[PDB]
From a paper:
Structural comparison of the RBS of the G225D mutant HA (gray) and the wild‐type HA (green) displaying slight conformation changes in the vicinity of the mutation site Asp225. Surprisingly, however, introduction of the single G225D mutation conferred significant binding and strong specificity for human‐type receptors. Binding was observed only to α2‐6‐linked sialosides, with preference for selected extended N‐linked glycans similar to a recent human H3N2 HA. In contrast, the G225D mutant has acquired the ability to bind human trachea epithelium and lost binding to chicken trachea. Furthermore, the H6 wild type and the G225D mutant demonstrate low thermostability that correlates to a high pH threshold for fusion, and are thus not adapted for human‐to‐human transmission (Linster et al, 2014). Thus, while the H6 G225D mutant adapts the HA to human receptor specificity, additional mutations to stabilize the HA for fusion at lower pH would likely be required to support transmission by respiratory droplets between ferrets and between humans.
Author numbering:
A (entry chain E): 1 to 262, 265 to 327
B (entry chain F): 1 to 172
C (entry chain D), E (entry chain B): 1 to 173
D (entry chain C): 2 to 262, 266 to 329
F (entry chain A): 1 to 330
């Protein structure tokens, strides 16, 4: 009968719940989800820069200049690299690209390369630079070809393979990434026919680096019909450094190389499509377009992404326990 | 609840009180209704918002996995990297999940405290001019006007002004 | 204790109350007893059990140290692995030890509040029909039945029913 | 007059917890979350026994040191136990190259299957029977060799010709195999054992290349040898082929292991006993339901999290304030 | 504040009460003063000092970075070291900053509780022998001299002794 | 008037604030700063042991015995090493010091070394010990000189460089850290001139180690007026081990070596230009001395000794007192 005033709290139609240390599944009036579990299954530009799609070429195929990787050939700037899992064009002539993992780490990243002719074929005197092709390395148009960045130097028809020599003096601002090889024949017969007779060496040097290799002749199991191998090498010529090359034979010479410009770099091994999308956070499994602080999508990303956790949900209560009547 | 008001001596909330977290329900000859306490509600919003932004801000760094490759003579450092990345992954997953559970418990207690403090704020105004029932509700020993009700909510309730009338009925 | 009840204005616990955490002690002409308040007790058990399980669950991942050997040319990576493994060990040891100290403090507060709230529940029902002795004890100004005691415990106590009897006693004194 | 009082539980508990505010607080109920107790032995994991290497190291076992015959053929293990004082390892002095990486690869395995990869008949016109040393006795014979290798020597006439071998994996499992290069102390021993001229060991697969030739010098005597053997290991992938070619100084692969691939290697003197465990640490078995343990970071199976804590007791009960009397 | 006392129903602090955290301000015919409540202040000091020392003890391990060099063929392990060291630095920076924010909130609340409990303690002794003015202040319905004041502070206040005097003054107004 | 008793709390003049989860900038009566941001920008003794100051020499210049580095020539003891970023005196004759990072890590940790003559010049027979000095490696006094710890052996006026052998047996209880080299001439001409004609080798071995290398002859870009290179190498001869040295030609022989004591103390190498003074420290970071009570520090993550934990934080102030709400004086 008397007038009344009561103290109370808000209630609403919320069915959203949180967990606490004391209690699970507590329906609460207002809450925020701090975790993002959704993604765009594609690759987008980052900082408005396109990624490099290596297509049917592996990283080895692209930077050695495998003849089937011509579409990649010659100048490139990238926000990150996409390498397709089933890409078939890599090292066409069998052999080992030495310090491969460390090369992959250097290239990624890495934001641009400028391809230039480091050693003109004219560099090597008294030898044939026009015949170093192989059926192992076909282009799309011709059955026997070779890497675009190397010259497989061979004996002139008449006479022995002389001492050949080359120098490149890095005069620019940028480090240069370059490649070379040593050929290891199947046979002493292949050795004699290609290079002359006698003990062969490949020696390279810079102000800070020393290389020396001689052929190791033996038959290895056939790969791309080749029982011979090439040991491939890479290095980086710093600004102001000079490279000296000197070989007796078996040299697979540096021909083209890369001015290399260097943040967070990324090589994504994925088959996802690269679309005319733009983005801020790119994950190996997709774009995150979110304001949330956590994500359960991937620990591998480029850009400004939220923090990866294994959690399915991270809902903070903000309002209070919901107890409607 | 820990302060015992929410889901406690005040059994339920008010779907009717739409414009605040904590508030008043009144009944008198002129009618009945709900009104949010704007000051405690805003101060809770301010507090909760700051907590949420403190949590976001402290969680704003990232561990970065890399997907470097490792050779068949690099199983040890390959596996070192994995245990390393998975190790930070496990720590942060733990930090986030525990923090959410803990802060969620503490936030429900804050709301509870706020309601309980508002209950006590009214109680101490009304003194003996009203009867404290079980449930956060006070039954006046005098006739409480819409101004009267407004005054309780303002913290400007005039206790002497109704003291004699309420003594009467409190006895009668 | 922070709510002030436990080891506070209620000085001691009851060894006699064996069937719950929080409860009522009553004395009337019919008898005297210790009876736990089941609802507050059971919610506290559910809450605490949940805290223990949440902590156990959140802690159920292991960092795994390894047996790998390092050569005399591998001092740097060997030391890297050692600082890494020690690092995670220091982090988890910290997480566990600090979490225990913190949760133990908050757990005691929760018990303290549950007692304090039960006490306020009774005090608001009784009003001036009872007199507050110290130590969380109320002396009724009226005869209080067993049925009357049950009513105070289950929250149905009738203040009007005993009001006239109470006032006569309170000031005859 | 009649009393109703509000109160809390007490009991005779004397167990305490620490708090951020307070230390040594007695509480009615509490849970210890940490296990500090262990069985000081090795047990089976998943009802699979560990392999006890006994008086052999991992090198002695896997190269087949003649005193490790115990220990020959197939092995299936939940984990490996290597005794700290094992004296039978590399009997003929030299380096097992990439030793740490071999130990980690063996640790990854759960089973090996021993089989004859290269029968002695493989190597034409050389002596398979002669290659034994006083550096490698068995318990019965004063001069023997590794069971898994053949120390090939030239025949009596005698000239050491080019010898070749191939094994094509043909199988579902990777093969772990070993070889060596002998480095004689003398020009005299070199000529005695192997013929005249520059000598080589060359090996290759589709993915791998090896070339080595003897480095001839006296080294400090170890087990009476101033000579050395350089030991090597590799894994032949399923579908891969191995070519071996040498004209001298080859310590040939003979027997190899089909390899089945957490797993661990425990260096410990603890006894393996006829018992089962679900959690095994390097210092012993944990039989516990506890969340934490201060026994060891190194284990196999499902173990609680390792921390340096002495105790982690969580109060569940309230402060214990029982009446005095 | 959360218990509602500090910067709450008690609006301000006392610069005058020099010897304690929490306490009393009294006025009577004899005089006026401030006295700290010794027992509540000392327990809070003990509790806070334990909290601080606990945090320092738990925070007393160090991750150690190392000045090792890495060559141009060591980009992967060099970066591994860097991400590892930065990783522990970020975890520890997070642990310390978050902990301070959380404990600072909880420390302020504990102080708020101790004030509210001290006020509640006096309020229950006094009963209706005193009138509640605002701001945690009671005006007595009887003469309360220094021994009477100390009486409230000590917890030994005699409600019966003054009930008759307090009752007459209360009616007269 | 009526008699009053009031319940209240302390306030004071403090203007010091703290943050909390719910509120920033809370002024409180009492608080503790747990983070240290002050340092002394200098290097001090750690265990009452002075650090080693390499000065104008790098770590390579020091242990190879670059002639310009004689100031550091004798025995050395240190609690840590300070290497000046701009030291000019390192590898004077151009070449690579192989496994350099792992050598720097070995030298850090790091308690002290005793220099001694491991292989006397007499060890090598039929070859000339005296010749090998280069303009590339001057001492401060002499224009052509060589590393103090190596002998650049050359062929005598004889046509031949004979096989030379050297042995050293460690009977000593301490590991010995020693160095050697292989010389790569730019020329077949220089190769002929300095050493015998024909195939050349450097071989060395211990009970646990084998080394073989032969010269790699080519022109390299000039460094210190040298297109030739030297491959430098280092190793540690364990107690009870023996080292055997054999060379055809092109051997830069071990001459002086170091007995090495490892240390219980964490070992550190600091690349810094900061001064070294006659002062004592308990905490030494790379950017300075910490002299503190505090739990936390934002100065550096690199240190030796006992230091507070490093964090990125600017301040870590824990409230200990309550909210400070003093009366408005007006
Ligand atoms: C819940 O509430 C929102 C806002 O009051 C309203 O728009 C929505 O229709 C309601 N949801 C239901 C129960 O359909
Ligand atoms: C390369 O060119 C730069 C500048 O022209 C010069 O200073 C440097 O000596 C050259 N390097 C050599 C050794 O040829
Ligand atoms: C090294 O010295 C010990 C003691 O003279 C000796 O027994 C041992 O044979 C020595 N080593 C060699 C290879 O002579
Ligand atoms: C305090 O507030 C001032 C201005 O509000 C701000 O510059 C500072 O970062 C805040 N934090 C502390 C603890 O002073």
């Amino acid at each position: 009968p008397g007038d009344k005033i009561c103290i109370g709290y808000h209630a609403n139609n919320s069915t959203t719940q949180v967990d606490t240390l004391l209690e699970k599944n507590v329906t609460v009036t207002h809450s925020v989800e701090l975790l993002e579990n959704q993604k765009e299954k594609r690759f987008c530009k980052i900082m408005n820069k396109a990624p490099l799609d290596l297509k049917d070429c592996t990283i080895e195929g692209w930077i050695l200049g495998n003849p089937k990787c011509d579409l990649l050939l010659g100048d490139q700037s990238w926000s990150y690299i996409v390498e397709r899992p089933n890409a078939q064009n890599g090292i066409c002539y069998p052999g080992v690209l030495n310090e491969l993992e460390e090369l992959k780490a250097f290239i990624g990243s890495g934001e641009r390369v400028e391809r230039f002719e480091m050693f003109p074929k004219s560099t090597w005197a008294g030898v044939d630079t026009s015949r170093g092709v192989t059926n192992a390395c076909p282009s799309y148009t011709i059955d026997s070809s070779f890497y675009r960045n190397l010259v497989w130097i061979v004996k002139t028809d008449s006479a022995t393979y002389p001492v050949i020599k080359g120098t490149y003096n890095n005069t620019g601002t940028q480090p240069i990434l370059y490649f070379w090889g040593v050929h290891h024949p199947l046979d002493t017969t292949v050795q004699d026919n290609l290079y002359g007779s006698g003990d062969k060496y490949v020696r390279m040097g810079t102000e800070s680096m020393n290389f020396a290799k001689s052929p190791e002749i033996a038959a290895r199991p056939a790969v791309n019909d080749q029982r011979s191998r090439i040991d491939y090498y890479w290095s980086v010529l710093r600004p102001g450094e000079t490279l000296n090359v000197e070989s007796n034979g078996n040299l697979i010479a540096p021909w083209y190389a890369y001015k290399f410009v260097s943040k967070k770099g990324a090589v994504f091994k994925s088959d996802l499509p690269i679309e005319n999308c733009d983005a801020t956070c790119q994950t190996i499994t997709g774009v995150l377009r979110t304001n949330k602080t956590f994500q359960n999508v991937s620990p591998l990303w480029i850009g400004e992404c939220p923090k990866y956790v294994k959690s399915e949900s991270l809902r903070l209560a903000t309002g209070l326990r919901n107890v409607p009547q | 609840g820990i302060f015992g008001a929410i889901a406690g001596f005040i059994e339920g909330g008010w779907t009717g009180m739409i414009d605040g977290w904590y508030g008043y329900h009144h009944e008198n000859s002129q009618g009945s209704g709900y009104a949010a306490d704007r000051e405690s509600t805003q101060k809770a919003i301010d507090g909760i918002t700051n907590k949420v932004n403190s949590i976001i801000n402290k969680m704003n760094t990232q561990f970065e996995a890399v997907d470097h490759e490792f050779s068949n003579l690099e199983r040890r450092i390959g596996n070192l990297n994995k245990r390393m990345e998975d190790g930070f992954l496990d720590v942060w997953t733990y930090n986030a999940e525990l923090l959410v559970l803990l802060e969620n418990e503490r936030t429900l207690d804050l709301h509870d405290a706020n309601v309980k403090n508002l209950y006590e704020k009214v109680k101490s105004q009304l003194r003996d001019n009203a009867n404290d029932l079980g449930n956060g509700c006070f039954e006046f020993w005098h006739k409480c006007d819409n101004e009267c009700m407004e005054s309780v909510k303002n913290g400007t309730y005039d206790y002497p002004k109704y003291q004699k009338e309420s003594k009467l009925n409190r006895q009668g």
